[PDB]
Symmetry: C2
Subunit: 236 residues, 2 copies
């Protein structure tokens, strides 16, 4: 079975890591969250489409689904966790207690504020997770990537042809994901912020699915201006 | 002395709000009084058209000179350096601010910080915090590594240097090494000299595709 996990944990402020509900901001007179959800509703293959969000935003999430006539019976809103990977595992636990996990189940996890993913990206994620167990959506780095350990001087400039910008979806065989997460210590779980890095750290392969330049994360006013441009131009 | 090197090696001529991208970029450098010269390097076949479009937009600033570019980007930079050397000679304190012609949205702050950083530290790269997690792959099929995200930055331009430092670092490199490097700040790092970071902007994009031009029109109107 194929599950969707929409991660609506908000975008944390620089000072204090306060999560802000950027997914509720308006994009062409409709919240970003709704644009993203509409993309997943068009995929008939999902058994459930689960939005995980902080307790304090659950009521408003349901209200927004109602206001925009989102009635699909597959949609469910659950409480998120202490961090993004913990929230993914809250989704996994909900699946296990609700349907029970099948050996071939896969989950497609995706940022609520990435509304411009495409049918191709989702189908390719599903197929790669079914075949290989773990998938990351990426685009080739176009800018040069530089590293620094002090925010003052360059440490290294890696070979650009090997560098990629990570996007989402990130998709997994569910049992594989559970086993990988179970191998990590609490410390490892505290520092790790990316879901595919769980898999890499437990020494299992992660496939690449190519995303799109316009599969942007809408988190700043600049990003909202670009997102409005993307919509008006029919780009995505 | 402070020099500008505008890298136009014909995307720089696409129209943006009734003005070529190159002119948008150039106007930002013209507004900096402290440049001794603003040198645009372009391919031989594009030099006359470049001069003509400058004339069309009333750009007469005597500090602007259009010269022939090189066989790769860093070769073109060294062509600009050689032109300065053959014209004024190089002073020990001279710095050069090199910048993509197709990056019209750099700011006064970015240029001034590049100049001051070059004067103080000798070499500087304009960067922003990585917008996405960076992932590496050696086979274009599977992940090889996921580096520590807080250490990752997206490189932009300007890139700015003490001129003698750049010349001396480049002279130490091999023919294979010079051909393979495509970045100028990597010249300096590979020759074990420090490179300082100056913060860029999310909107300091390189305008090279129709998507980038749609984004650029949004940037301008807003």
């Amino acid at each position: 079975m194929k599950y969707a996990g929409i991660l609506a944990g908000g975008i944390g402020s620089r000072m204090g890591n306060v999560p802000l509900p950027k997914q509720f901001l308006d994009l062409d007179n409709k919240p970003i969250l709704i644009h993203t959800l509409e993309k997943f509703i068009l995929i008939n293959d999902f058994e459930k489409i689960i939005i995980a969000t902080p307790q304090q935003w659950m009521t408003h999430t349901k209200d927004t689904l109602r206001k925009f006539k989102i009635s699909d019976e597959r949609i469910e809103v659950i409480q998120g966790g202490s961090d993004r990977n913990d929230t993914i595992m809250n989704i996994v636990k909900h699946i296990e207690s609700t349907n029970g996990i099948n050996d071939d189940d896969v989950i497609v996890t995706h940022d609520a504020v990435r509304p411009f993913l495409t049918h191709r990206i989702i189908k390719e994620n599903i197929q790669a997770a079914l075949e290989y167990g773990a998938v990351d959506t990426v685009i080739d780095a176009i800018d040069t990537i530089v590293t620094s350990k002090d925010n003052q001087t360059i440490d290294a400039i890696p070979v650009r042809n090997e560098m990629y910008q990570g996007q989402t979806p990130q998709s997994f065989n569910i049992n594989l994901l559970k086993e990988s997460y179970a191998q990590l210590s609490d410390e490892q779980k505290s520092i790790l912020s990316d879901a595919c890095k769980i898999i890499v750290e437990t020494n299992k392969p992660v496939r690449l699915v190519k995303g799109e330049l316009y599969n942007i994360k809408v988190t700043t006013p600049y990003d909202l201006k670009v997102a409005n441009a993307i919509i008006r131009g029919g780009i995505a």
